[PDB]
């Protein structure tokens, strides 16, 4: 797929894109990883990731932090076997601790990561697990997340006359509306069949057009068609329940509020969506 | 395990050492993290440095050879290079850098930085101490502990970044956004330091740092830097110094070098030359 980026002062736009596309080749996902954990059920992954989104909203963590944690959790579980369901909480909160230290300026302290587990996970258990995760991933902790792709697509959609790519200039409401569909989709392990850039392009298509999807992603219909069809019931349930409004967060500039991870009762929505 | 031939300083996390691998006899540099002393486990700076250097591979970027977790210590194993540019310039051979070497070091610096930016990485601590030189003429960016992988587009990041003397004015004036441009400013400062043998702007505070820059380049205005008066730590009460001619500061530098220095030290981050454009500059042409 050709580069949707404008001419850049700071790089060759085609190299910058090639490098981003090479990430999706380097960072692998496996929609069947739970076959290596044969008594785990996909609903257990849904419950764990939904809970991490709740922790993120409580502590005002970035959507980037949540999607780093989701990626770490999914890639780590794909490297292991026979994990007992009682350890998913520890793996998830340790994934989010790593993501938070990477991505936040002032991440919560270890004691808050332990605190939110209501006695199930000590600080020491989280420090052991973070090293287990980072070694199993070979310190590959720089994926291009689902939400990073939405961010780049929104910037291309709304690009000003100066072709400025680094200073953000898209509206907040379209961004959180598409992210909300993505947050629902990521609770279903079948989402991992699709590259993260294709999951994001597909949720964008469901909120826009073929013409905008092609302009911002460079994908052709044939690339996203299977993802778009898989996403239909998820988009429907979001359109029927209605989209959430932009929230205000204590100490967050109201113009940056769209970058903060939110939480709604998505397990309800998930049931309805997988029902169809 | 690793034959710790010598200590060679302290760092962003823990302490630094020269050493030899027993099963190879190969020289390495060792950063030791004492996990027993870290309440937050592996420090953010180390997770960032390791993750970035696992994938950021270029002739003008220091190589991370291994990461070793043994007992309650984490060791970052880097390739060994003889010394940094600061230690080189402070020593007798290096007191007077030839004009050809200043040019070949700057070219390499820009190649390394250009590769970082094209890979969506901002270094945020470029200074002579963090540029490692080998015995063949190569120079490499080191200490990626203060770096960040940025989004396209990016968001607000850590407010106070870059060693004070190398810190761009958009940071000193508290801009909400900074870009890859903060790295180019640092390179401008490093270029001048190679030519003059001393720091271009050795401030003792943010305001002193800001004043030393304005004295040399003139006080920015809405005309030379649109939006500057709107910047949070801007004050109408700044003296209105006038731009010194650059030939007076770096007289032994060839005119095309002085042109390049001037483009690197544009105070408007919007107008500041990129590493990619700097590499195409006539200063580097034969």
| Catalytic residue list of B | 125
Q: First CA to last CA across chain A, in angstroms?
A: 32
Cβ contact, residue pair B153, A107, below 8 Å: no
- Record the resolution, in angstroms: 2.2
Residue burial B10-26, b: 16+ Cβ < 10 Å; e: rest: ebbbbebbebeeeeeee
CB contact under 8 A, B275 and A110: no
Contact residues on chain A for B159, CB-CB shorter than 8 A: 105
Q: Give the span between the Cα atoms of B83 and B131, in whole angstroms.
A: 9
Are A19 and A138 part of one and the same domain? no
Which of A114, A142, A170 is the endpoint of a domain?
Answer: A142
In this structure, the answer to whether residues A276 and A165 fall within a common structural domain is yes
User: What span, in angstroms and rounded, lies between the C-alpha atoms of B286 and B266?
Assistant: 25
Query: How many Cβ atoms are within 10 Å of A276's Cβ, its own excluded?
Result: 9
> Residue A2: inside a domain, yes or no?
no
Query: Rounded CA gap, B198 and B269, in Å?
Result: 24
In a domain, A4, yes or no: no
Cα A108 off chain centre by: 20
Q: CA torsion sign, B46 to A20 to A60 to A155? A: positive
Mutate to test the interface with B, among A6, A10, A15, A197 (most CBs of B within 10 A): A10
Question: Other C-beta atoms within 10 Å of A18: how many?
Answer: 12
Give domain status of residue A1, yes or no: no
Tokens read off for B91: 């020593």
Chosen domain end from A125, A142, A159: A142
Tell me if A7 is assigned to some domain. Answer: no
CB proximity list for A19: less than 8 A, separation 6 or greater: B118, B119, B120
Q: Does residue A39 share a domain with residue A20?
A: no
Residues A55 and A104 in one domain: yes
Note if the bond before B153 is cis, omega within 30 degrees. Answer: yes
| Structural domains in chain B plus CATH codes | 2-79 (3.30.200.20), 83-284 (1.10.510.10)
* Residues sharing a CB contact under 8 Å with residue A245, sequence separation 6 or more, in sequence order: none
**Which residues in chain B are closer than 8 Å to A151, comparing Cβ atoms?**
151-153
Interface residue of B34, B145, B151, B274 to substitute, partner A, most A CBs within 10 Å:
B151
Q: How far is CA B57 from the centre of its chain?
A: 17
Q: What is the torsional sign of CA A96, A99, A105, A106?
A: positive
Residue at A55 is within a domain: yes
**Torsion of the alpha carbons at B204, B205, B208 and B212, rounded to the nearest 10:** 70
Q: Chain A: residue nearest B160 by CA? A: A105
- A109-118: list long-range contacts, CB under 8 Å, 24+ apart: A109/B39, A109/B40, A110/B39, A110/B40, A110/B41, A112/A59, A116/A55, A116/A58, A117/A89, A117/A90, A117/A93
Q: A219: domain range?
A: 12-29+143-276
HEC-encoded secondary structure of B129-146 = HHEEECCCCCEEECCCCC
A127 closest CB neighbour out of B41, B157, B179: B41
Pick from B13, B134, B2, B6: which is nearest to B80 by CA? B134
Contact list, B39 vs chain A (CB under 8 Å): 109-110
**Neighbouring residues of A20: CB distance < 8 A, sequence distance ≥ 6:** A144, A152, B120
Q: Compute the Cα dihedral for B119, B120, B123, B128 and give only its sign.
A: positive
- In terms of Cα–Cα distance, which of B194, B196, B200 is closest to B105? B194
List CB contacts of A118: < 8 A, sequence separation 6 or more: none
Residues of B with CB under 8 A from a CB of A: 35, 39-44, 47-48, 50-52, 54-55, 67, 69, 114, 117-120, 149-159, 177, 179-180, 274-277
Counting beta carbons within 10 angstroms of the beta carbon of residue B136, is it exposed (0 to 12), middle (13 to 18) or buried (19 or more)?
exposed
CB-side exposure of B45: number of CA atoms within 13 Å? 16
Q: Three-class SS string for A95-147? A: HHHHHHHHHCCCCCCHHHHHHCCCCCCCHHHHHHHHHHHHHHCCCCCCCCCHH
Break sites following residues in chain B (C–N > 2.5 A): none
Clarify whether residues A102 and A189 are in a common domain.
no
Q: Give the gyration radius of chain A's Cα atoms.
A: 18
Query: Is the Cβ–Cβ distance between B44 and A107 less than 8 Å?
Result: yes
B105 to A6, B101, B126, B133: CA distances (angstroms):
31, 6, 13, 9
Measure CB to CB from residue A259 to each of B119, B120, B155 and give the nearest one: B155
Distance from CA of B34 to the nearest CA of A (A): 13
Same domain, A73 and A133: yes
What's the Rg (C-alpha) of chain B?
20
Residues A61 and A179 in one domain: no
In our burial notation (b when 16+ CB lie closer than 10 A, e otherwise), range A250-267 reads eeeeeeebbbbbbbbebe
Q: Say whether both A199 and A148 belong to one domain.
A: yes
For residue A35, give how far its alpha carbon lies from the nearest alpha carbon of chain B (Å).
Answer: 29
Q: Solved how?
A: X-ray
Residue of A nearest to B55 (CA): A140
CA B108 to chain centre: 13
Do the domain assignments include residue A5? no
B227 is in an annotated binding site: no
By the 10 Å C-beta count (0-12 exposed, 13-18 middle, 19+ buried), B132 is classed as buried
What whole-number distance in Å separates Cα of residue B131 and Cα of residue B97? 15
Find out whether B174 is annotated in a ligand binding site.
Answer: no
Smallest Cβ–Cβ distance between A138 and the set B52, B54, B117 belongs to B54
Q: Is residue A50 part of a domain?
A: yes
A-chain CB neighbours of B40 within 8 Å are 101, 109-110
Judge whether A67 lies within some domain: yes
B195-229 burial code (b ≥16 CB/10 A, e <16)? beeebbbebeebeebbbbbbebbebbeeeebeebe
Closest CA to B116 of B177, B191, B47, B55: B55
Please give the structure tokens belonging to residue B274: 């990129």
Identify whether the C-beta of residue B273 lies closer than 8 Å to the C-beta of residue A9.
Answer: no
DSSP annotation of A260 reads B
User: In chain B, what's the furthest Cα-to-Cα distance?
Assistant: 64
How far apart are alpha carbons B173 and B209 in whole angstroms?
11
Show residues of chain B in contact with A168, CB under 8 Å.
Answer: 153-155
DSSP secondary structure, A5-72, as one string: SPP-SSS-HHHHHHHHHHHHHHS---TTGGGGSTT--HHHHHHHHHHHHHHHHHTT-BHHHHHHHHHH
Q: How many CB pairs under 8 A join A and B?
A: 107
Spell out where chain B has E strands: 2-10, 15-21, 27-34, 64-70, 73-79, 83-84, 121-122, 131-133, 139-141, 148-149
A173 and A274: one domain? Answer: yes
C-alpha span between B74 and B65 (Å, rounded): 14
One domain, residues A99 and A231: no
Residue in B closest to A139 by C-alpha: B51
Nearest CA-CA partner of B33 in B77, B3, B90, B64: B77
Number of structural domains (chain A) is 2
Exposure letters A185-200 (e unless 16+ CB within 10 A, then b): bbbbbebbebbbbbbb
Q: Are residues A154 and A193 in the same domain?
A: yes
- Residues A276, A252, single domain; the answer is yes
């Amino acid at each position: 797929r050709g580069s949707p980026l404008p001419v850049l002062s700071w790089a060759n736009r085609e190299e910058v894109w090639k490098i981003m596309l090479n990430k999706e080749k380097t960072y692998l996902r496996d929609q069947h990883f739970l076959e290596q954990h044969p008594l785990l059920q996909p609903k257990m992954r849904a419950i764990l990731l939904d809970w991490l989104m709740e922790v993120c909203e409580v502590y005002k963590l970035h959507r980037e932090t949540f999607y780093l944690a989701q990626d770490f959790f999914d890639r780590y579980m794909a490297t292991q076997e026979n994990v007992v369901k009682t350890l998913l909480q520890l793996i998830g909160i340790s994934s989010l601790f790593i993501a938070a230290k990477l991505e936040e300026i002032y991440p919560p302290k270890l004691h808050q990561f332990a605190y939110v587990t209501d006695g199930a996970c000590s600080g020491d258990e989280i420090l052991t697990m973070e090293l287990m995760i980072m070694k199993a991933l070979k310190w590959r902790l720089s994926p291009l997340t689902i939400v990073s792709w939405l961010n780049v697509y929104m910037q291309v959609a709304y690009l000003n006359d100066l072709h400025e790519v680094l200073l953000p200039q898209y509206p907040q409401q379209i961004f959180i509306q598409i992210a909300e569909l993505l947050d629902l989709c990521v609770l279903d392990v079948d989402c991992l069949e699709f590259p993260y850039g294709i999951l994001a392009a597909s949720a964008l298509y469901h909120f826009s057009s073929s013409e905008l999807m092609q302009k911002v992603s460079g994908y052709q219909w044939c690339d996203i068609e299977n993802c778009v069809k898989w996403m239909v019931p998820f988009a429907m349930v979001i359109r029927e329940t209605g989209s959430s409004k932009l929230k205000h967060f204590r100490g967050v500039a109201d113009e940056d509020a769209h970058n903060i991870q939110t939480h709604r009762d998505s397990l309800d929505l998930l049931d309805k969506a997988r029902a169809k | 395990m690793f034959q710790k031939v010598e200590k060679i300083g302290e760092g962003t996390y823990g302490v630094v050492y020269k050493a030899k691998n027993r099963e190879t006899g190969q020289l390495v540099a060792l950063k030791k993290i004492r996990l027993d002393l870290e309440m937050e486990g592996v420090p953010s700076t180390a997770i960032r440095e390791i993750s970035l250097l696992k994938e950021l591979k270029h002739p003008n970027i220091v190589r991370l050879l291994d990461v070793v977790h043994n007992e309650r210590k984490l060791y970052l194993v880097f390739e060994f290079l003889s010394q940094d540019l600061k230690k080189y310039m402070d020593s007798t051979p290096g007191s007077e850098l030839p004009l050809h070497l200043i040019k070949s070091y700057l070219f390499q610096l820009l190649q390394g930085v250009s590769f970082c930016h094209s890979h969506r990485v901002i270094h945020r601590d470029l200074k002579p101490q963090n540029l490692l030189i080998n015995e063949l003429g190569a120079i490499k960016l080191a200490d990626f502990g203060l770096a960040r992988a940025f989004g396209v587009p990016l968001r607000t990041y850590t407010h106070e970044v870059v060693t004070l003397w190398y810190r761009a004015p958009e940071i000193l004036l508290g801009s909400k956004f900074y870009t890859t441009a903060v790295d180019i400013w640092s390179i401008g400062c490093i270029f001048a330091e190679m030519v003059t043998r001393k720091a271009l702007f050795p401030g003792d505070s943010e305001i002193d740092q800001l004043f030393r820059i304005f004295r040399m380049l003139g006080t920015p205005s809405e005309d030379t830097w649109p939006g500057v008066t709107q910047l949070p730590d801007y004050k109408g009460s700044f003296p209105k110094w006038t731009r010194k001619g650059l030939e007076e500061i770096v007289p032994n530098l060839e005119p095309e070098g002085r042109d390049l220095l001037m483009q690197l030290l544009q105070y408007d981050p919007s107008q500041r030359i990129t590493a990619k454009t700097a590499l195409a500059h006539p200063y580097f042409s034969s």
